[PDB]
Scaffold this motif. Structure first.
Motif, PDB file in Angstrom:
ATOM      1  N   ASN A   2       0.770  -1.221   0.000  1.00  0.00           N
ATOM      2  CA  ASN A   2       0.000   0.000   0.000  1.00  0.00           C
ATOM      3  C   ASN A   2       0.810   1.283   0.000  1.00  0.00           C
ATOM      4  N   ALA A   4       1.092   4.580  -1.115  1.00  0.00           N
ATOM      5  CA  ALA A   4       0.138   5.511  -1.698  1.00  0.00           C
ATOM      6  C   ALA A   4       0.857   6.632  -2.474  1.00  0.00           C
ATOM      7  N   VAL A   7      -2.666  11.632  -6.315  1.00  0.00           N
ATOM      8  CA  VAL A   7      -3.615  11.530  -7.418  1.00  0.00           C
ATOM      9  C   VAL A   7      -4.311  12.892  -7.528  1.00  0.00           C
ATOM     10  N   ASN A   9      -7.063  15.381  -7.624  1.00  0.00           N
ATOM     11  CA  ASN A   9      -8.412  15.465  -7.060  1.00  0.00           C
ATOM     12  C   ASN A   9      -9.307  16.342  -7.932  1.00  0.00           C
ATOM     13  N   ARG A  24      -5.089  14.296  -3.799  1.00  0.00           N
ATOM     14  CA  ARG A  24      -5.528  13.308  -2.836  1.00  0.00           C
ATOM     15  C   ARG A  24      -4.494  12.175  -2.770  1.00  0.00           C
ATOM     16  N   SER A  25      -4.667  11.207  -1.894  1.00  0.00           N
ATOM     17  CA  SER A  25      -3.712  10.141  -1.689  1.00  0.00           C
ATOM     18  C   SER A  25      -4.454   8.846  -1.944  1.00  0.00           C
ATOM     19  N   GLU A  26      -3.855   7.996  -2.740  1.00  0.00           N
ATOM     20  CA  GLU A  26      -4.446   6.708  -3.085  1.00  0.00           C
ATOM     21  C   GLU A  26      -3.390   5.683  -3.443  1.00  0.00           C
ATOM     22  N   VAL A  28      -2.433   3.374  -5.902  1.00  0.00           N
ATOM     23  CA  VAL A  28      -2.610   3.130  -7.330  1.00  0.00           C
ATOM     24  C   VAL A  28      -1.399   2.383  -7.899  1.00  0.00           C
ATOM     25  N   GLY A  53      -8.246  12.153 -11.335  1.00  0.00           N
ATOM     26  CA  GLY A  53      -7.972  10.739 -11.176  1.00  0.00           C
ATOM     27  C   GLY A  53      -6.574  10.311 -11.667  1.00  0.00           C
ATOM     28  N   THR A  55      -2.517   9.772 -11.751  1.00  0.00           N
ATOM     29  CA  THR A  55      -1.446   9.694 -10.766  1.00  0.00           C
ATOM     30  C   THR A  55      -0.384  10.729 -11.107  1.00  0.00           C
TER      31      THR A  55
END
Length: 66
Positions: A2, A4, A7, A9, A24-26, A28, A53, A55
């Motif tokens: 994971n 992160a 990304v 937003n 944002r943090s994701e 991916v 959306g 990266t």
């Protein structure tokens, strides 16, 4: 597992200086700029339009070096 990444937003227009609301943090794949770096990214300019959306990759940010 994971790691992160940052990304977009929202659509970040070409040459915009990044603000906190835009990132944002994701978790991916592929992995991009680590989410821990969002502080350092503030005020840095993007060199291409970044769609919602997407990266954020190291090569997309002018002056990014980690």
């Amino acid at each position: 597992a994971n790691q992160a990444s940052v990304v977009a937003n929202q659509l970040i227009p070409i040459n915009t200086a990044l603000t906190l609301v835009m990132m944002r943090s994701e978790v991916v794949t592929p992995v991009g700029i680590p989410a821990e770096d969002i502080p350092r990214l503030v005020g840095m300019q993007v060199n291409r339009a970044v769609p919602l959306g997407t990266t954020l990759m190291p090569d997309m940010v002018k002056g990014y070096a980690a």
